[PDB]
């Protein structure tokens, strides 16, 4: 057959991280894997368009932060960028 890439298992453990009782029916697994595919496509498409406009050829942390600060609305961008900055600073606090 064929192995398929899907974000079902990760959505499920983020779900049981948030509130430890409720489970998700399979059509909500389908909505969430299509959702993370669509948000990932928007942020990577804006990533390649910024690195293309700016006459560079590499995508780094500053550029994904600029893509997030553009795309998301008013406060959601502010706290999403603060999540990104603390996750990256702890990643480089290990290696």
């Amino acid at each position: 057959k064929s192995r398929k890439e899907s974000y079902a298992i990760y959505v499920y453990k983020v779900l049981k991280q948030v509130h430890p009782d409720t489970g998700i029916s399979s059509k909500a697994m389908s909505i969430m894997n299509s959702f993370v595919n669509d948000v990932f496509e928007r942020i990577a498409g804006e990533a390649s368009r910024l690195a293309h406009y700016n006459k560079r050829s590499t995508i780094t942390s500053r550029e994904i932060q600029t893509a997030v600060r553009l795309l998301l609305p008013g406060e959601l961008a502010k706290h999403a960028v603060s999540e990104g900055t603390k996750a990256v600073t702890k990643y480089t606090s290990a290696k």
């Binding site: 059509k27 389908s30 909505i31 894997n33 299509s34 959702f35 595919n37 669509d38």
Partner: protein, 78 residues
């Protein structure tokens, strides 16, 4: 067979969207706008499929033909 989508089904599609009273000449108008929408979206679905040298039009292709008009559908694997 555009007449097949029945008249009280158009009435229930209206009454989902908050409407109270429905006119009499509205039914040919909503069949017209349904035929415009369906003909555009299966034009793009057919274009993707007959590109890929295939004949079963797959639901991932109709999700792509909805994706390019902005009005993308979730739940079916985009």
């Amino acid at each position: 067979n555009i007449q097949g989508i029945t008249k009280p089904a158009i009435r229930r599609l209206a009454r989902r969207g908050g409407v109270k009273r429905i006119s009499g000449l509205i039914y040919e108008e909503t069949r017209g706008v349904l035929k415009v929408f369906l003909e555009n979206v299966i034009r793009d679905a057919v274009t993707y499929t007959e590109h890929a040298k295939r004949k079963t039009v797959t639901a991932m292709d109709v999700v792509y033909a909805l994706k390019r008009q902005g009005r993308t559908l979730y739940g079916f694997g985009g």
